[PDB]
Amino acid sequence: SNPYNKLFEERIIFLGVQVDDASANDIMAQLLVLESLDPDRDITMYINSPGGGFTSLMAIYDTMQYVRADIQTVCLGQAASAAAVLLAAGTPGKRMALPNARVLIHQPSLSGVIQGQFSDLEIQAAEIERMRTLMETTLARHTGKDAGVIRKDTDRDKILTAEEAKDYGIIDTVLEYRKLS
Amino acid sequence: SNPYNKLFEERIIFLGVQVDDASANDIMAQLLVLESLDPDRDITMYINSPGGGFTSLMAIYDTMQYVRADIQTVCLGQAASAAAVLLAAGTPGKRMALPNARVLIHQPSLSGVIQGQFSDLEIQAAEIERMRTLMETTLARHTGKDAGVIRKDTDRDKILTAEEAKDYGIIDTVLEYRKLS
Amino acid sequence: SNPYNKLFEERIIFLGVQVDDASANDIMAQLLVLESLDPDRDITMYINSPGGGFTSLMAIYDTMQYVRADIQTVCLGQAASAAAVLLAAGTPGKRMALPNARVLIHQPSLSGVIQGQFSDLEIQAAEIERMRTLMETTLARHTGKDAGVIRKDTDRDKILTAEEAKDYGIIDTVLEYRKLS
Amino acid sequence: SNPYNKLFEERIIFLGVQVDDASANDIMAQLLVLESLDPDRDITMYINSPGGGFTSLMAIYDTMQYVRADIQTVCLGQAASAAAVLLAAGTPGKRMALPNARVLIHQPSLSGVIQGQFSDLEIQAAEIERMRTLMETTLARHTGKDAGVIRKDTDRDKILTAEEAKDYGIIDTVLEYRKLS
Amino acid sequence: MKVLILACLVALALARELEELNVP
Amino acid sequence: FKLTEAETTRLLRMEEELHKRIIGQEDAVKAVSKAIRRTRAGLKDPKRPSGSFIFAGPSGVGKTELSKALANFLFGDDDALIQIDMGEFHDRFTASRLFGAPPGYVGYEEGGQLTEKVRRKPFSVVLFDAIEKAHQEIYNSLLQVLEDGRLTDGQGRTVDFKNTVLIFTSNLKPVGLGFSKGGMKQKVNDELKKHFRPEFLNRIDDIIVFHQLTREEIIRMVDLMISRVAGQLKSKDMALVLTDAAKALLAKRGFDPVLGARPLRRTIQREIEDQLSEKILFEEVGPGQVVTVDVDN
Ligand SMILES: Nc1ncnc2c1ncn2[C@@H]1O[C@H](COP(=O)(O)OP(=O)(O)OP(=O)(O)O)[C@@H](O)[C@H]1O
Ligand SMILES: CC(C)C[C@H](NC(=O)[C@H](Cc1ccccc1)NC(=O)c1cnccn1)B(O)O
Ligand SMILES: CC(C)C[C@H](NC(=O)[C@H](Cc1ccccc1)NC(=O)c1cnccn1)B(O)O
Ligand SMILES: CC(C)C[C@H](NC(=O)[C@H](Cc1ccccc1)NC(=O)c1cnccn1)B(O)O
Ligand SMILES: CC(C)C[C@H](NC(=O)[C@H](Cc1ccccc1)NC(=O)c1cnccn1)B(O)O
Ligand SMILES: [Mg+2]
């Protein structure tokens, strides 16, 4: 067994890589297996991800909201873009983050230019607008902010230190070091 | 066993990747095995796909319509282009989608330019027209729309939220979260 | 075991990929093994191929004509160019196709330009002409057409729907869906 | 078993490669497994890394500070950029380095240009400034320097020989050769 | 390992009582 | 024989008399009550047994209790239930307890512990408790039992299992794998297809997958289990009376969908009849006194 197989025996999934469809289908497959192995024991989800992806975000957003088990998110070094939404998507009272982890909340973007007629670009922009409102509505029900506050805050990159990510509501506890180590 | 091997034991196939011939032959091989293991137990088909491919669409469209088992489609984060047709291609009463999954119905396109004489391009265009009518005839027998309504709706990209994809007829139930999680 | 290993236990080979020498030597190795395992039980050959290749076509054309077992071809989503010849190359009474599979019969081409002196190009063109006549002579003994009819029909791309591929003689039955599914 | 599997049985992890997210998630998975196998036995961490990465640094900085086991860092040939911070991040009294290992402490940089509006670049620069202060605050609590001294020292590349890396406070012992060898 | 012992009970080898032939 | 006027009315009351013990499980009762109506209307198949059931379902919802409510209905006690505890049969060779030893082996004279229970009582409810926990060819010895209606003894006597009602209570935690709306019976039905050999499933007359005990049925189950401790175990000139808030408190503590009626039974021996057993030994309330149970909080 790997370490990654050993953490999964203790119901811990790594996000680790960026949230694309390949990573989202991995995490959804891991969240549903861990739901079936013990639905009343908390899945822990370690997040060191640079973000990326919205449908892949909302694939593993909805799955960690679907499953019978409570999700404990732990931000390791980084939760940027989509991964900060997944960090807030843990169960309240859960959602740890290590003390030097940065949390980068950020409005949705298009990676590169997508061409098309203006009637096709009015739809790709009505979609990136409803991707923006869905990013802010999701992040408001998990941080307790007012979803126009998040639109003002995620208007640019807002890098949150873990101590000011629990003041923002992204996490709940900046988890302390166990032994001085 | 992987998680993907574990979901397949519970008769769940991921679409996951885009629908190309490599992915279509995988899903057809999975649909026929799950038909042979238990033909009277519902195959579930998880769809997080960005679409693509029409012959690869109609390869796994026809197979999930062929097999003795009812197909339960579940849109995870995305069912775009060909995958939205596969999402509607589930059994009626089945066809779930997660609440923040987008469904992108979309008329067939050519990825890039295909050259040729005009007598060769009158045939590639009579084919992309009958690919368009077959996309609309398939999506009309599964949504209950009138197939000219779908031509008006899929004239551009029509991104459907899951709540308005069951109003459209693509899915039947926006499936609720099990525990608050 | 994979699904592909499971279909091969039930004497089913996928064409799946395009017909090149790597795919042709795979299918010939699979056809000869399935001939040796049970020579009086029908090999099924699933065809979702975009075609390509003539010597690789006639490698697995001749092998599926060689073997003691009858070959049942099934067009999944596509049988283009060479693969449509392999689709017609099944045993008469066999040769199914799924209802939304397209069959693209097509005269042989050269992928890209091959240079040379004119005395070398008179031979590459006498070869692509006898590749054309061999494509039409093969497709006439399996469809019952008159081989000048096929020269008129495959003069351009002739995409056949499965319902009009049995009228053409490429397949014999458009195979019905088992359960509504 | 590999040698790398054999060193991990003796609770030794290699840093080895540069600190990116792929390497950080490996080391965090290794540090948490070795914490769970025996939390009161010292994890040794071999560092031959060229550095790189700040969130990946602070991912495995925080983990080696989190775990119940004391971390013994050993610089093999090189601890540059982030890896020198990880070298100082070992337990005091631990933190060896081989006699010809160089330690390159270095202020954070951006690999290549990141574009954007000036209001977006005021935030990427307020982040690389707080990445700089966090690099200096971390390296001051582990070397005993005054964190403005480190800003003066890491203003350029400061390559420390192991004998002058214990005078700097990065390591504690330049570990002697066992047998003349 | 899961080799069963097969008791194989014999039929009863038992004594016999006697009718006797009367004499003077 | 042609039925007494009383026995005719009781047998049309057979659902509502088996519901005096079985709370809920309505299609479970009217599948096993119809099997007795077939036997007594003279419509029993004279080759097939009278009833052949797999009472599959969740653990604790009344699989064994319906087999005991059936045996009390047909006999007057549930000690007339022939209960073969199939957890004892863990390997292939304990099938020699169903029909006894073959010739030339010890235990040949005793000739089976199921066949000889039915030679004495051919009209019997034969319970096979936890048939899933038998070996894969214990129940392959019952493939002539459930069509031909007889089992050949090791001594050489075919015994009539025709007038028996065979019951195979199989035992089939929260939600399964993956996305699904709501939240089941087809999961239990097809697990029988994977565990049991479908030769055995075709011989079963009815496969009944049992229901979750609803909260409206746990409230009725409180009244049944308090009726155990009073009247049979409080024949000490003591009377046990529960207020309607007290039975509501027991139902709110004993109700978990996934187990059913044993967490209620563990609740009553944690709230009621262990606090009551401390009050009898201390003689706070003792013999010759009516106990009322007010609600605690
Ligand atoms: N339907 C029921 N009616 C009355 N009491 C019930 C019922 N179901 C459960 N109980 C109570 O809980 C006990 C458990 O019922 P039963 O013995 O039938 O369990 P079971 O369903 O066979 O479970 P298992 O899977 O463990 O065999 C009963 O003896 C009774 O006290
Ligand atoms: C903050 C959350 C919402 C995610 C952030 N941005 C997005 O929403 C991502 C950014 C992205 C990633 C890859 C390719 C294109 C765009 N948006 C999308 O995935 C996306 C997809 N289709 C249309 C529009 N946006 B993150 O990636 O910065
Ligand atoms: C909506 C369904 C029908 C599928 C959508 N479009 C198509 O039909 C796809 C789009 C596509 C994908 C890959 C390469 C070229 C073209 N069309 C085809 O596959 C295709 C293939 N041959 C000729 C014409 N179209 B999807 O890919 O946007
Ligand atoms: C019925 C089939 C054979 C018709 C078409 N295929 C071909 O003609 C293929 C396509 C191809 C592949 C490689 C190099 C050149 C050409 N023809 C040949 O294999 C080929 C090979 N050598 C000389 C001439 N043609 B189809 O696949 O487009
Ligand atoms: C000394 C420690 C802090 C690490 C050193 N520098 C950094 O902090 C690294 C240098 C680096 C590496 C890869 C890609 C881009 C930038 N900083 C970062 O990783 C980084 C990441 N996001 C924004 C700004 N800096 B090392 O890489 O020279
Ligand atoms: Mg029981």
* Ligand 2 atom with minimal separation from the A107 CA: 1
Residue B4 contacts residue B14 (beta carbons within 8 Å): yes
Q: Which of B56, B81, B111, B119 is catalytic?
A: B81
Residue B36 contacts residue B4 (beta carbons within 8 Å): no
Touching chains B and C? (3+ Cβ pairs < 8 A): yes
* Ligand 1 atom with minimal separation from the F225 CA: 31
Residues with Cβ within 8 Å of residue D111, at least 6 apart in sequence: D52
Annotated active-site residue B111? The verdict is: no
Cα angle vertex C32, ends C31, C37, to 5°?
100
Nearest ligand to residue C129 Cα: 4
Name the CA radius of gyration of chain C, rounded.
16
Name residue, tokens 């209905």. F73
Report how far residue A167's alpha carbon sits from residue D75's, in angstroms, rounded to the nearest whole number.
38
- The phi, psi pair for B47, rounded to 5°, reads -125, 110
Handedness of CA C47, C53, C54, C57 (dihedral sign): negative
| Cβ burial, residue D110 (10 Å; 0-12/13-18/19+) | exposed
Q: Which of D106, D111, D119, D181 is catalytic?
A: D106
For ligand 1, whether the C-beta of F222 sits within 6 Å is: no
Residues with Cβ within 8 Å of residue B118, at least 6 apart in sequence: none
- The phi, psi pair for F241, rounded to 5°, reads -120, 130
Q: How far is the CA of C51 from the centre of ligand 4 (A)?
A: 9
| Long-range contacts (CB closer than 8 Å, 24 or more residues apart) made by F41-46 | F44/F162, F44/F163, F46/F162
Name residue, tokens 């694309």. A20
Backbone φ/ψ region at F107: left (φ over 0), alpha (ψ -120 to 50), beta:
left
**Which amino acid is located at A180 in the chain?**
L
Q: Which of D49, D56, D81, D142 is catalytic?
A: D81
Strand (E) or helix (H) holding F247:
helix F244-253
* Ligand 2 atom with minimal separation from the A56 CA: 19
**Which of C54, C60, C143 should be mutated for ligand 4, with most atoms under 8 A from CB?**
C54
**Bridge pairing between strands A158-161 and A102-105:** antiparallel
Residue F273 contacts residue F226 (beta carbons within 8 Å): no
- What's the gap between Cα D160 and its chain centre? 14
Q: How many CB atoms lie within 10 A of CB D17?
A: 14
Report how far residue A42's alpha carbon sits from residue A45's, in angstroms, rounded to the nearest whole number.
10
Nearest ligand to residue C19 Cα: 4
Report how far residue D66's alpha carbon sits from residue B161's, in angstroms, rounded to the nearest whole number.
42
**Bridge pairing between strands A43-49 and B43-49:** unpaired
- Mutate one of A23, A76, A106, A157 to test the D interface: name it (highest D CB count within 10 A): A76
**Bridge pairing between strands C43-49 and B158-161:** unpaired
Cα angle vertex C107, ends C104, C112, to 5°?
105
Q: How many CB atoms lie within 10 A of CB D10?
A: 8
Inter-CA distances, C169 with C79, C87, C139, C146, D96, Å: 14, 10, 9, 11, 79
Q: Give me D82's structure tokens.
A: 């982030």
Closest among D48, D146, D55, D148 to D104, alpha carbons compared: D48
Inter-CA distances, D176 with D100, D102, D180, Å: 11, 16, 10
For ligand 1, whether the C-beta of F249 sits within 6 Å is: no
Least Cα separation, residue F201 to chain B (angstroms): 15
Cα angle vertex C155, ends C153, C159, to 5°?
60
Longest dimension (CA), chain D: 60
In chain B, which ranges are continuous DSSP H helix? 3-9, 21-37, 55-66, 82-88, 118-143, 149-153, 162-165
Report how far residue F207's alpha carbon sits from residue F192's, in angstroms, rounded to the nearest whole number.
9
Chain A residues near any Cβ of chain B (below 8 Å): 21-22, 24-26, 28-30, 32-33, 36, 39, 55-71, 91, 119-120, 123-124, 126-127, 130, 134, 138
Q: To 10 degrees, the CA torsion angle through B51, B52, B55, B58? A: 10
Query: Resolution of the deposited coordinates, in angstroms?
Result: 2.8
Closest among A149, A170, A99, A106 to D123, alpha carbons compared: A106
Q: How far is the CA of B26 from the centre of ligand 5 (A)?
A: 41
Annotated active-site residue A142? The verdict is: no
**Bridge pairing between strands B102-105 and B158-161:** antiparallel
Report how far residue F119's alpha carbon sits from residue F101's, in angstroms, rounded to the nearest whole number.
17
Q: Give me F271's structure tokens.
A: 């709230």
In D13-81, which ranges are continuous DSSP H helix? 21-37, 55-66
3-state per-residue secondary structure call for chain A? CCHHHHHHHCCEEECCCCCCHHHHHHHHHHHHHHHHHCCCCCEEEEEEECCCCCHHHHHHHHHHHHCCCCEEEEEEEEEECHHHHHHHCCCECECEECCCCEEEECCCCCCCCCCCCHHHHHHHHHHHHHHHHHHHHHHHHHHCCCCCHHHHHCCCCEEEEHHHHCCCCCCCEECCCCCCC
Q: How far is the CA of B111 from the centre of ligand 3 (A)?
A: 7
Least Cα separation, residue B94 to chain F (angstroms): 9
Chain E residue nearest residue F106, CA to CA: E9
